[PDB]
Design a protein around this ligand. Structure first.
Ligand SMILES: *[C@@H]1O[C@H](CO)[C@@H](O[C@@H]2O[C@H](CO)[C@@H](O)[C@H](O)[C@H]2NC(C)=O)[C@H](O)[C@H]1NC(C)=O
Ligand SMILES: *[C@@H]1O[C@H](CO)[C@@H](O[C@@H]2O[C@H](CO)[C@@H](O)[C@H](O)[C@H]2NC(C)=O)[C@H](O)[C@H]1NC(C)=O
Ligand SMILES: *[C@@H]1O[C@H](CO)[C@@H](O[C@@H]2O[C@H](CO)[C@@H](O)[C@H](O)[C@H]2NC(C)=O)[C@H](O)[C@H]1NC(C)=O
Ligand SMILES: *[C@@H]1O[C@H](CO)[C@@H](O[C@@H]2O[C@H](CO)[C@@H](O)[C@H](O)[C@H]2NC(C)=O)[C@H](O)[C@H]1NC(C)=O
Ligand SMILES: *[C@@H]1O[C@H](CO)[C@@H](O[C@@H]2O[C@H](CO)[C@@H](O)[C@H](O)[C@H]2NC(C)=O)[C@H](O)[C@H]1NC(C)=O
Ligand SMILES: *[C@@H]1O[C@H](CO)[C@@H](O)[C@H](O)[C@H]1NC(C)=O
Ligand SMILES: *[C@@H]1O[C@H](CO)[C@@H](O)[C@H](O)[C@H]1NC(C)=O
Ligand SMILES: *[C@@H]1O[C@H](CO)[C@@H](O)[C@H](O)[C@H]1NC(C)=O
Lengths: 245, 334, 259
């Protein structure tokens, strides 16, 4: 399966099969580092804590707004009712009713805006569950930084944590490159890969991993002559048909 | 009418390299409101009467502070994708491709591209007490202030320049790991392979493709310099914010059922018992105006946040890579 | 410079506030201007960490309208900063002040103000015939945390506005379907939270089980697979995530913010 996912990012599967223990060890060490980094950093889950903090703060503000007068003589209904007849108590309780109705309407409006934001975040989380966990994504930075291999979901309080396993290239080397190879008056182009050279010798390799190979007629295809391509390089293209001929 | 037949196909014998613009809003202006100066400006009796309403203005300031922090978060999420400031080489031999209209101009005092200079000239946006003793002055005298963005336009231009240098020197490799250099004709041959065309098509038509690219960039510059309504969305955002602030200023002339709109005219004709009813009416009306402004700003900030999330996604998938999604990064094969 | 017509005494602004007057003794026109102007912000590294603060005065040019001057003053485009030293180095942003200026608390400890750094400089060795190809790789696992739902709340309007008062309830009946509207909105939010959770998590309809022998070619999923020993069948990572987030209350247990 992970050889298939290596094929999905442009690396041949023999790279995985010849490095299976190393890839497994790197995956295990990365999962253990994820466990340690989540156990150490206190502000790692601040996105989920902010939702709980905002909801609790909104409810406590709604409770605390019952102490306001809103232009009336008091904030307690029972103190108004025990000092006034039904007409002036009607006036003061009308002021309190208008103020508390305004407080409730403000709370409901802010909750609607916050719920729209939470719904957008949940639609994004459902899209990431569909495209990162249930498949392999070619979208850049949608499922982590690097070439995405696979993702794993974890439940969290009011949320989801995605563990994105990605492939990162490392230990680059610079080589001399050419667009085409001129062998017999014909221009040769790589079928998949890139011509590279160590100054003296020319090979064709895959683009995301250094694996040099002898430039043959099976590695390359022919298009035109050596007069159109700018930067074409003279080299020999080996023919496998006539050592055995 | 497509000439459909059961054994007929149409195959293109040529191509066009097309450059199109997409304009996306990212942030809006960060505003702060002093409640006491807006409702009860330089009046002690009004401030004492406003103290009986509670944490309403704390709620309003919390909402506006959240909006102001979210604007900087929007700009950071769109532009600060890479953390290395890549530079273009001093020799600009890119196989015939000419990025001079999008690369920074070192002669200008602001290191901006010619296209970026045109875009900044085509969108029209410290005010001390001494030089105010103007709509901004009237806004600032009623407690309404505009906070500056955290990243200046020079820093955004630096981030854009780093993204451009990384793209034209390394292709999509710098967005997924270390920046691996590649010649630009070979990079666009890779991108031709990404849309299903063999690379010999590019290598046998390199001068024509480079000329089409250069002419399309020059046409983009001319069409942005000519059409006045090209940057309509950013100007609409600026106009909406300015109109909201001016409506908030102009709403101080309403009576809201009281005998007047001036605090001092009420206070100079009435004793504090009969003044207090009118001051309470003005306080309720101006509190309603502030709450309406904050609610509209929250809805507008949600829309701007959606636009900024889309712009960050387009920066990730169109600039840092090659997209197979149809019409996400222009019309045609991206 | 206003020229009043002879029947006029006061001049008004666009907000209908009196900003011009005619002096009744010497007939000259005066402009009235408010005294208070300019916003003020405070910068602290935490009251637990220290007691010194920095003060940012917006709309103030120090090349004054300040509370107290100090030993170090700094003029940013966000205003005049008093109480913070200005250094010439560039770091990452700790406390955002604005206009490219950030502040931090460094060691004798004091608040420093600096221009933010966008990142380390890099120059790709571009050539027209040179390519860079990786010879190795790293397998990297990164976390992404996404909110899905929030708490579902319901409000009894009569108990909030007019709690255990019959006269207040009979007065609240003369306002109409406002509280029915509020409860409808909150019910829609509460239903939407369950819809959000169902759309994120209930993608598959079969409950798949891992095999009892965990031979996966060397790959170890023990930190993300469920732990059968725990009373809650969660992964170790999931148990850590549930411990790291802090979220029936009877009448007899109440007679507390929730109460
Ligand atoms: C570029 O590739 C060639 C071909 O592999 C390298 O030549 C080989 O060098 C080793 C050195 O130990 C010899 O043992 C081989 O016999 C050589 N192969 C031949 C002659 O076909 C060459 O060294 C490489 N360039 C560099 C700079 O390492
Ligand atoms: C690549 O190889 C071709 C073929 O051997 C070279 O072309 C010849 O170059 C010589 C010297 O200039 C001429 O006298 C011949 O007439 C050319 N033949 C053809 C068929 O064009 C070419 O010069 C080589 N290129 C490099 C850079 O060495
Ligand atoms: C493919 O299209 C290009 C662009 O239209 C053609 O290039 C033009 O060719 C005409 C005739 O040779 C010239 O007058 C123009 O100056 C060329 N334009 C450019 C930008 O170079 C090209 O000829 C077409 N090729 C085919 C095979 O139809
Ligand atoms: C890239 O294109 C620009 C034009 O868009 C070229 O700049 C022109 O250069 C010529 C000669 O150097 C001047 O006469 C023009 O005034 C320049 N125009 C502008 C708008 O600057 C530039 O030379 C091109 N780059 C390369 C490498 O040829
Ligand atoms: C590719 O990278 C891996 C990871 O760093 C290298 O594996 C390490 O190799 C060193 C030296 O042999 C050992 O000390 C480490 O224990 C290895 N790490 C792991 C996780 O196995 C590997 O050698 C590199 N391969 C090449 C060709 O450079
Ligand atoms: C690279 O540039 C050098 C110097 O201008 C030139 O001689 C060479 O032909 C160029 N190679 C390619 C492939 O463009
Ligand atoms: C502050 O005043 C000085 C004195 O003219 C001026 O040079 C400087 O630009 C002003 N600062 C701002 C932010 O306007
Ligand atoms: C997986 O890792 C844990 C701790 O890292 C270890 O205890 C366990 O034995 C490992 N699983 C296997 C099959 O080795």
């Amino acid at each position: 399966q992970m050889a298939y996912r290596f094929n999905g990012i442009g690396v041949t599967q023999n790279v995985l099969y010849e490095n299976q223990k190393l890839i497994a060890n790197q995956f295990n060490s990365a999962i253990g580092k994820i466990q340690d980094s989540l156990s150490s950093t206190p502000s790692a889950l601040g996105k989920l804590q902010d939702v709980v903090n905002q909801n609790a703060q909104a409810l406590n503000t709604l409770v605390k707004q019952l102490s306001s007068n809103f232009g009336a003589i008091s904030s307690v209904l029972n103190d108004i009712l025990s000092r006034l007849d039904p007409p002036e108590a009607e006036v003061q309780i009308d002021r309190l009713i208008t103020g508390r109705l305004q407080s409730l309407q403000t709370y409901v409006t802010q909750q609607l805006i916050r719920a729209a934001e939470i719904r957008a975040s949940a639609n994004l989380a459902a899209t990431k569950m569909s495209e990162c966990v249930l498949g392999q994504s070619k979208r850049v930075d949608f499922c982590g930084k690097g070439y995405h291999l696979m993702s794993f979901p974890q439940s969290a309080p009011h949320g989801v944590v995605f563990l994105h396993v990605t492939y990162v290239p490392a230990q680059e080397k610079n080589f001399t490159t050419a667009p085409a190879i001129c062998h017999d008056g014909k221009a040769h182009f790589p079928r998949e890969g890139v011509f590279v050279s160590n100054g003296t010798h020319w090979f064709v390799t895959q683009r995301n991993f250094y694996e040099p190979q002898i430039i043959t007629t099976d590695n390359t295809f022919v298009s035109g002559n050596c007069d159109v391509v700018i930067g074409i390089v003279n080299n020999t293209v080996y023919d496998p048909l006539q050592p055995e001929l | 009418s497509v000439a459909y037949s059961n054994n007929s196909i149409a195959i293109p014998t040529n191509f066009t390299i097309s450059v199109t613009t997409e304009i996306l809003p990212v942030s809006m202006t960060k505003t702060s409101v002093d409640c006491t100066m807006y409702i009860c400006g330089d009046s002690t009796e009004c401030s004492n009467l406003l103290l009986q309403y509670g944490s309403f203005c704390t709620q309003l300031n919390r909402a506006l502070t959240g909006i102001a922090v979210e604007q900087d978060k929007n700009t950071q999420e769109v532009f600060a994708q890479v953390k290395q400031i890549y530079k273009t080489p001093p020799i600009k031999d890119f196989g015939g491709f000419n990025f001079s209209q999008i690369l920074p101009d070192p002669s200008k005092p602001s290191k901006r591209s010619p296209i970026e200079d045109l875009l900044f000239n085509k969108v029209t946006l410290i005010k001390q007490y001494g030089d105010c003793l103007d709509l901004i002055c009237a806004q600032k005298f009623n407690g309404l202030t505009v906070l500056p963005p955290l990243l200046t336009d020079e820093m955004i231009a630096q981030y854009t320049s780093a993204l451009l240098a990384g793209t034209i020197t390394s292709g999509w490799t710098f967005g997924a790991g270390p920046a691996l250099q590649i010649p630009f004709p070979m990079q666009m041959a890779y991108r031709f392979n990404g849309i299903g065309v063999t690379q010999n098509v590019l290598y046998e038509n390199q001068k024509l493709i480079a000329n089409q690219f250069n002419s399309a960039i020059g046409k983009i510059q001319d069409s942005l310099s000519s059409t006045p309504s090209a940057l309509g969305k950013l100007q609409d955002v600026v106009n909406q914010n300015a109109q909201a602030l001016n409506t908030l200023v102009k709403q101080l002339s309403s009576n809201f059922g009281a005998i007047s709109s001036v605090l001092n005219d009420i206070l100079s004709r009435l004793d504090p018992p009969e003044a207090e009813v009118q001051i309470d009416r003005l306080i309720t009306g101006r509190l309603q105006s502030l709450q309406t402004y904050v609610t509209q700003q929250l809805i507008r900030a949600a829309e701007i946040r959606a636009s900024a999330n889309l712009a960050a996604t387009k920066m990730s998938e169109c600039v840092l890579g090659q997209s197979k999604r149809v019409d996400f990064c222009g019309k045609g094969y991206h | 410079n206003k020229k009043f017509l002879p029947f006029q005494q006061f001049g008004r602004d666009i907000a209908d506030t009196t900003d011009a007057v005619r002096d009744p003794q010497t007939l000259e026109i005066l402009d009235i201007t408010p005294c208070s102007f300019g916003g003020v912000s405070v910068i602290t590294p935490g009251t637990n960490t220290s007691n010194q603060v920095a003060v940012l005065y917006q709309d103030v040019n120090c090349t004054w309208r300040v509370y107290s001057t100090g030993s170090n003053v700094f003029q940013t485009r966000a205003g005049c900063l008093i109480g913070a030293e200005h250094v010439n180095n560039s770091y990452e942003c700790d406390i955002p002040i604005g206009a490219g200026i950030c502040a931090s608390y460094q060691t004798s400890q004091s608040i420093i103000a600096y221009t933010m750094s966008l990142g380390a400089e890099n120059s790709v060795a571009y050539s027209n015939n040179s390519i860079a190809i990786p010879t190795n790789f790293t397998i990297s696992v990164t976390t992404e945390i996404l909110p899905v739902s929030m708490t579902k709340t319901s409000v009894d309007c009569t108990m909030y506005i007019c709690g255990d008062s019959t006269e207040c309830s009979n007065l609240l009946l003369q306002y109409g379907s406002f509280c029915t509207q509020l409860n409808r909105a909150l019910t829609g939010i509460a239903v939407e939270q369950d819809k959000n959770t169902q759309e994120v998590f209930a993608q598959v309809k079969q409950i798949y089980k891992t095999p009892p022998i965990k031979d996966f070619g060397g790959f170890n999923f023990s930190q993300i697979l469920p732990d059968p020993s725990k009373p809650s069948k969660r992964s170790p990572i999931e148990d850590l995530l549930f411990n790291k987030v802090t979220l029936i209350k009877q009448y007899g247990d109440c007679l507390d913010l929730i109460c």
